[PDB]
Amino acid sequence: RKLEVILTTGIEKLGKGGETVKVAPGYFRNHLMPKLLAVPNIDKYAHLIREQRKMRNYEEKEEVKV
Amino acid sequence: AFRGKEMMKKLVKKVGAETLTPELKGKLKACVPDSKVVMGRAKRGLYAGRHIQYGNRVSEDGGNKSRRCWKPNVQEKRLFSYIFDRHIKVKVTTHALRCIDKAGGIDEYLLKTPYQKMDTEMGLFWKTKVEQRYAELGQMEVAFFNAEDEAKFEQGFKDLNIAKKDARREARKEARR
Amino acid sequence: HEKLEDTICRMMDNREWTTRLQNSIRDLIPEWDHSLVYNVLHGAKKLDHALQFFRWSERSGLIRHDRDTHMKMIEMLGQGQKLNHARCILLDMPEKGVPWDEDMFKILIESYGKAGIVQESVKIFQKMKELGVERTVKSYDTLFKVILRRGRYMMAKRYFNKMVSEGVEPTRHTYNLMLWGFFLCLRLETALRFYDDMISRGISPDVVTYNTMINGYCRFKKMDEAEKLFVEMKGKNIEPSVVSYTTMIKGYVSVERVDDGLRIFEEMRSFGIEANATTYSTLLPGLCDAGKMVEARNVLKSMMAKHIAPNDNSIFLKLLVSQSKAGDMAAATEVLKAMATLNVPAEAGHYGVLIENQCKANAYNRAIKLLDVLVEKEIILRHQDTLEMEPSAYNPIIEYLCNNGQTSKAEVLFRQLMKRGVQDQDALNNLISGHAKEGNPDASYEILKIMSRRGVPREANAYELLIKSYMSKGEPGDAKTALDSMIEDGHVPDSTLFRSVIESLFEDGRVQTASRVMMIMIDKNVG
Amino acid sequence: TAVQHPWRAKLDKYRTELTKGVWGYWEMGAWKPLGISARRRAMLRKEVLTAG
RNA sequence: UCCAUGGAUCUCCGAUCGGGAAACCGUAUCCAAGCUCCGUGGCUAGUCUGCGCUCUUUGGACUUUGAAAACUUAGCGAACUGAAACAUCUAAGUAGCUAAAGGAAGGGAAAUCAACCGAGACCCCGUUAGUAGCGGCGAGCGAGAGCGGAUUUGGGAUUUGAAGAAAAAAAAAAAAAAUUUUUUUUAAAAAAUUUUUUUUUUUAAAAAAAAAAAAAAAAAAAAAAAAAAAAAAAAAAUUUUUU
RNA sequence: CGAUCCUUCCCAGUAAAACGCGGCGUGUUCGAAUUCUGAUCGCUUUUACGCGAGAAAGGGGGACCACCCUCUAAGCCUAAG
Ligand SMILES: [K+]
Ligand SMILES: [K+]
Ligand SMILES: [K+]
Ligand SMILES: [K+]
Ligand SMILES: [Mg+2]
Ligand SMILES: [Mg+2]
Ligand SMILES: [Mg+2]
Ligand SMILES: [Mg+2]
Ligand SMILES: [Mg+2]
Ligand SMILES: [Mg+2]
Ligand SMILES: [Mg+2]
Ligand SMILES: [Mg+2]
Ligand SMILES: [Mg+2]
Ligand SMILES: [Mg+2]
Ligand SMILES: [Mg+2]
3-state secondary structure C140-153: HHHHHHHHHHHCCC
Exposed e or buried b per residue across C229-257, where buried means at least 16 C-beta atoms within 10 angstroms of its C-beta: bbeebeeeeeebbbbbbbbbbbbbbeeeb
Query: Which of B80, B146, B147 lies closest to A33 in CB terms?
Result: B80
A55 contacts in B (CB within 8 Å)? 144
CB–CB of B105 and A33 under 8 A?
yes
Q: Which nucleotide, over all strands, has the C1' atom closest to the CA of C245?
A: E189
Chains linked to A by 3 or more Cβ pairs within 8 Å: B, C
Q: How many whole angstroms separate alpha carbon D5 and alpha carbon D20?
A: 24
Determine the distance between C124 (CA) and E44 (C1') in angstroms: 62
**Per-residue b/e over B158-171, b at no fewer than 16 CB within 10 Å?**
eeeeeeeeeeeeee
Can you count the helices (H) and strands (E) in chain C? 31, 0
Confirm if C105 and C73 have CB atoms less than 8 A apart. no
Q: Which nucleotide is nearest to C120 (CA to C1')?
A: F2
Question: Chain C contact for D15, CB < 8 A?
Answer: yes
d(CA C407, CA C440): 10
- Which three-class secondary structure state does DSSP give residue C41? helix
Closest to A29 (Cβ–Cβ): which among B101, B144, B146? B101
Residue D34 phi, psi (nearest 5): -70, 155
Q: How many CB atoms lie within 10 A of CB C490?
A: 8
CA-to-CA separations, C300 to B37, B73, C268, C276, C312, in angstroms, rounded: 81, 87, 18, 13, 15
**CA distances to A17, C76, C108, C121, C187 from C116, in Å:** 62, 17, 13, 10, 22
* Residues C441, C439: Cα–Cα separation, whole Å: 6
Contact C292, C329 (CB under 8 A): no
Pairing verdict, β B53-58 and A38-40: unpaired
Quick check: C447 and C431 in contact, CB under 8 A? Answer: yes
For B150, list phi and psi in degrees, rounded to 5: -65, -40
Q: A2 in helix, strand or coil?
A: coil
> Can you name the residues that pair with A15 across neighbouring β-strands?
A11
Using the mean position of ligand 1's atoms as its centre, give its distance from the Cα of residue B67 in Å. Answer: 15
Distance (Å, whole) CA C417 – CA C265: 45
| Cα–Cα distance measured from residue C271 to residue C247, given in angstroms and rounded to the nearest whole number | 16
Q: Could you tell me if A18 and A6 are in contact, meaning their C-beta atoms sit under 8 angstroms apart?
A: yes
Across the interface, whether the CB atoms of C454 and D52 are under 8 A apart is answered yes
* Alpha carbon C394 to its chain's center: 25
Give the closest nucleotide to D12 (alpha carbon vs C1').
E159
Q: Which experimental method was this entry solved with? A: cryo-EM
Rg (CA), chain C: 36
Ramachandran quadrant class, C133 (left: phi over 0; alpha: psi -120 to 50; beta: rest): beta
Pick the closest to residue B106 from B117, B116, B115, B89 (CA basis).
Answer: B89
Task: Identify which of C384, B166, B16 has the alpha carbon closest to the alpha carbon of residue D12.
Answer: C384
Please say whether the beta carbons of C354 and C334 come within 8 A: no
What is the C-alpha separation between C142 and C121, in angstroms, rounded?
Answer: 9
Nearest to C482 by CA among C495, C471, C496, C494: C471
- Asked if C451 and C482 touch (Cβ cutoff 8 Å), the reply is no
Q: What CA–CA distance (Å, rounded) separates B4 from A64? A: 62
Question: What's the rounded Cα separation, in Å, for the pair C342 and B2?
Answer: 67
Using an 8 Å Cβ cutoff, are C338 and C304 in contact? Answer: yes
Phi, psi of C459, deg, nearest 5 = -75, 165
Separation of alpha carbons C85 and D6, rounded Å: 35
CB atoms within 10 A of CB C378: 9
If we measure between CA atoms, which residue out of C145, C196, C192, C199 comes closest to residue C173? C145
Which pairing describes strands B65-70 and A38-40: parallel, antiparallel, or unpaired? Answer: unpaired
The residue type found at D52 is: G
- Cα gap C324→C330, rounded to integer Å: 9
Q: Give the DSSP H or E segment for D33.
A: strand D30-33
Q: Tell me which protein residue sits closest to nucleotide E78, measuring alpha carbon to C1'.
A: B67
Which bin fits C145, alpha (ψ -120 to 50), beta or left (φ > 0)? alpha
Span CA (C79) to C1' (E232), Å: 61
Strand partners, B55: B68
Q: What's at C279, amino acid-wise?
A: T
Q: How many CB atoms lie within 10 A of CB C353?
A: 21
Long-range contacts from A29-38, C-beta under 8 angstroms, 24+ separation: A29/B80, A29/B101, A32/A5, A33/B80, A33/B105, A34/B80, A34/B87, A36/A8, A37/A7, A37/A8, A37/A9, A37/A11, A38/A5, A38/A6, A38/A7, A38/A8, A38/A11
Strands in C68-225 per DSSP E? none
> Helix, strand, coil proportions of chain B in percent (round to 5)?
55, 15, 30
Q: How far apart are CA A4 and CA C372, in angstroms?
A: 69
Between vectors from CA C518 to CA C515 and to CA C519, what angle results, nearest 5°? 90
Q: Which residues contact D12 (CB under 8 A, 6 or more apart)?
A: none
Cβ–Cβ below 8 Å for D28 and C14: yes
Residues C526/C493, Cβ–Cβ less than 8 Å: yes
Distance, first Cα to last Cα, chain C = 96
Distance C312 CA to ligand 9 centre (A): 69
Q: How many Cα atoms are found within 13 Å in the side-chain-facing hemisphere of D12?
A: 7
Q: How many CB atoms lie within 10 A of CB A21?
A: 19
Ligand 14 mean position, distance from CA D23 (Å): 23
Identify any residues that bridge with B87 across adjacent strands, giving them in sequence order.
Answer: B80
Q: How many CB atoms lie within 10 A of CB C266?
A: 9
Specify whether the CB–CB gap between C39 and C7 falls below 8 A.
Answer: no
Q: Are strands D24-27 and A20-23 parallel, antiparallel or unpaired?
A: unpaired
Report how far residue C254's alpha carbon sits from residue C283's, in angstroms, rounded to the nearest whole number: 11
Query: Length of chain A in residues, anyone?
Result: 66
Alpha-carbon gap, residue A17 to C61, rounded angstroms? 27
Could you tell me if residue A36 is left (phi over 0), alpha (psi between -120 and 50 degrees) or otherwise beta?
A: left
Q: For residue B90, what is the enclosing H or E element?
A: strand B86-93
Which of C46, C51, C64, C56 shows the shortest CA–CA distance to C19? C56
Report the protein residue whose CA lies nearest the C1' of nucleotide F22.
B55
B4 CA → E14 C1’, Å: 32
Residues from C in contact with A at Cβ < 8 Å: 20, 23, 26-27
Q: What angle do CA B55, B61, B64 make, to 5 degrees?
A: 35
* Residue C367 φ/ψ region, left for φ over 0, alpha for ψ in the -120 to 50 degree band, beta for the rest: alpha
SS3 state at B46? strand
Where is C473: in which H helix or E strand? helix C461-473
User: φ and ψ at B68, to 5 degrees?
Assistant: -135, -175
Three-state secondary structure of C425-453? HHHHHHHHHHHHHCCCHHHHHHHHHHHHH
Report the candidate in C390, C413, C381, C418 with the shortest Cα–Cα distance to residue C400: C413
Query: Does the CB of D51 have a partner CB in chain C at under 8 Å?
Result: no
Contact A66, B132 (CB under 8 A): no
Yes or no, beta carbons of A47 and C23 under 8 Å apart: yes
CA of D34 to C1' of E146 (A): 30
Q: Name the 3-class secondary structure at C274.
A: coil
What whole-number distance in Å separates Cα of residue C404 and Cα of residue C401? Answer: 5
How many residues make up chain C in this entry? Answer: 527
DSSP C78-102: HHTT-HHHHHHHHTTTTTTT----H
Angle made by CA atoms C182, C184, C187, in degrees to the nearest 5: 45
Q: Name the strand (E) or helix (H) holding D25.
A: strand D24-27
Is C119 exposed, middle or buried, given 0-12, 13-18 or 19+ CB atoms closer than 10 A?
Answer: exposed
DSSP one-letter code for C254:
T
Å from B104 to nearest chain A CA?
Answer: 5
Closest residue to E168 (CA to C1') is C341
CA atoms of C372 and C172, how far apart (whole Å): 60
- CA distance linking residue C463 with residue C477, whole number of Å: 15
Q: How close is the nearest chain B Cα to the Cα of A20, in Å? A: 14
User: Measured in angstroms, what separates residue D16's CA from nucleotide E171's C1'?
Assistant: 38
Distance CA C273, CA C353 (A): 36
On chain C, the residues whose CB falls within 8 A of the CB of D15 are 383
| B54 at A interface, C-beta within 8 A | no
Measured CA to CA, the distance from residue C54 to residue C17 in angstroms comes to: 13
- Which is nearest to C417 in space by CA: C454, C449, C444? C454
Q: Which amino acid, C148?
A: L
Contact D52 C418 (CB under 8 A): yes
